[PDB]
Chain A
Amino acid sequence: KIKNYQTAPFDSRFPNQNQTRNCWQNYLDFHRCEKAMTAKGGDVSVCEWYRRVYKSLCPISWVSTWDDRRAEGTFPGKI
């Protein structure tokens, strides 16, 4: 599908200056999709668009802290 990807497009769920949730949402959606695939032996590849949006939007230090905490068992979001 649409994978002449330049950057995350406008998302009407997050139309204002504060884009924190946009980053966070796409970070949750990717790692949720990821879990519901390494599960049924399916392809992570369907999860790709979330991966590209959260990587476009999210500060590196955020992703890094979120990834460290998933590993530690302290990630406060539901995945």
Chain B
Amino acid sequence: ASAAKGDHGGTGARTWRFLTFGLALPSVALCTLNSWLHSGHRERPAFIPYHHLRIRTKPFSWGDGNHTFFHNPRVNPLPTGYEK
């Protein structure tokens, strides 16, 4: 494997807590580092009104029927381009 420890063989609860605090949560802490460093808002792309995107065959059943459910003005253009 891409894995090499030894068999912990001394009551299961103690071993799994060992793994929780020894491996599991440290991994979550490193990946939390790696993510709250590669984050920060980024160059939004030129709006091109491609026909395979911003699909509208029926209005959405909320708002003005033209905004998706988790609409972000910054990064989600409407079919007519980004909002003012």
Contacts and interface: CB of A to CB of B under 8 A. Distances in A.
Interface of A: 69, 72-74, 76
Q: Which 6 A-B pairs have the closest CB atoms?
A: A74-B50, A74-B49, A74-B51, A76-B50, A74-B48, A76-B52
Contacts of A76: 50, 52
Contacts of B52: 76
B48 A73 contact: yes
Q: What does DSSP make chain B's interface, helix, strand, loop or mixed?
A: loop
A72 B52 CA distance: 14
A73 B49 CA distance: 8
Given A72-B49, A76-B50, 7 more contacts: A69-B51, A73-B48, A74-B48, A74-B49, A74-B50, A74-B51, A76-B52
Interface in B43-77: 48-52
Contacts of B49: 72, 74
A69 B49 CA distance: 10
A17 to B, nearest CB: 24
A27 to B, nearest CB: 16
A17 B50 CA distance: 29
B8 to A, nearest CB: 54
